[PDB]
Amino acid sequence: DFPRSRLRFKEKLGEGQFGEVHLCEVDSHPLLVAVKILRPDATKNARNDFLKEVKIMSRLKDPNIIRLLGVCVQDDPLCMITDYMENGDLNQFLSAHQLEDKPTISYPMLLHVAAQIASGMRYLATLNFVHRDLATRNCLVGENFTIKIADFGLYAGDYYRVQGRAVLPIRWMAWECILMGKFTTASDVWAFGVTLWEVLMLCRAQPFGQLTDEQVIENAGEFFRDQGRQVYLSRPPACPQGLYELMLRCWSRESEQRPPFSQLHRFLAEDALN
């Protein structure tokens, strides 16, 4: 596990903080995989983060979570190998589709997309694993509208950057994450609510897109104060009222009032059809 010389590099797919992903072919006719390797400018800190991500990823084994197929971590150079998800991230994919009138996507397909994210998150919750950056940009799309959640690191405007602070996806963040940096399964539910809003919007608009970062942060202060001045994402045109109410439960002020992923999954697979 795994002979590096079996890998044939084809195209660079993307790039993050301590790694670079490439499309590769495996001889082992044409098997495609995604391969993450260190960036050319990698430091010893990047090598350490890459080894950790290997450890984190090795534990995740579910149909709707990206799966580690293999590793080069013994003799150099370091590599991580996953399924190649041929349709890219879900944000770009939904951006290229329009909702069916009466490349298109049906409303029941939007539900099926959301249900797969909810099942993936259901699995993470059983492991008490907190994702901290659930969004359509961190979901990958395979064949037959198969969704795998990644942890994935472009979408610069989706993160609030202050020097010397962690980079924060504030528009997906529960009011208590913004005010206190506390991330829990309950805050992943709130982000799931925002992710479901993105799916039903077909990624046509940034969440709170007409509000500044500072207004989004002061809106978290309004959830805290609980004086009826907090503001929510509006109902997407493709979204019925019943499904909108489910998004609103994800954005309950009280963390314990937010539905668990098992309930969100049931609703989107079953109740949402009626």
17 among the known binding-site residues?
yes
Rounded to a whole number of angstroms, the CA Rg of the chain reads: 19
Q: Tell me whether residue 82 or residue 119 sits nearer to ligand 1N1 (CB atom).
A: 82
Q: Catalytic residue, from 49, 89, 133, 188: name it.
A: 133
Site for ligand 1N1 contains 34 (CB under 6 A): yes
**How many residues belong to the site for ligand 1N1 (CB under 6 A)?**
18
**Residue 150 binds to ligand 1N1 (criterion: CB under 6 A):** yes
Q: Does 171 bind ligand 1N1 (CB under 6 A)?
A: no
In order, the DSSP letters of 133-144 are --SGGGEEE-GG
For the chain, report the end-to-end CA distance as a whole number of angstroms: 48
Tell me which of 21, 111, 135, 243 binds ligand 1N1, using CB under 6 A: 21
Site for ligand 1N1 contains 35 (CB under 6 A): yes
Beta strands in the chain (DSSP E): 7-15, 20-26, 31-37, 68-71, 79-83, 98-99, 104-105, 139-141, 147-149
Tokens 């978290």 locate to: 220
Q: Rounded to an integer, what distance in angstroms lies between the CA atom of residue 196 and that of residue 247?
A: 7
For this structure, is 101 an active site residue? no
> Under the rule (CB under 6 A), what is the footprint of ligand 1N1?
13-14, 21, 34-36, 66, 80, 82, 84-89, 140, 150, 152
Task: Point out the annotated binding site.
Answer: 13-21, 36
Q: Catalytic residues, which ones?
A: 133
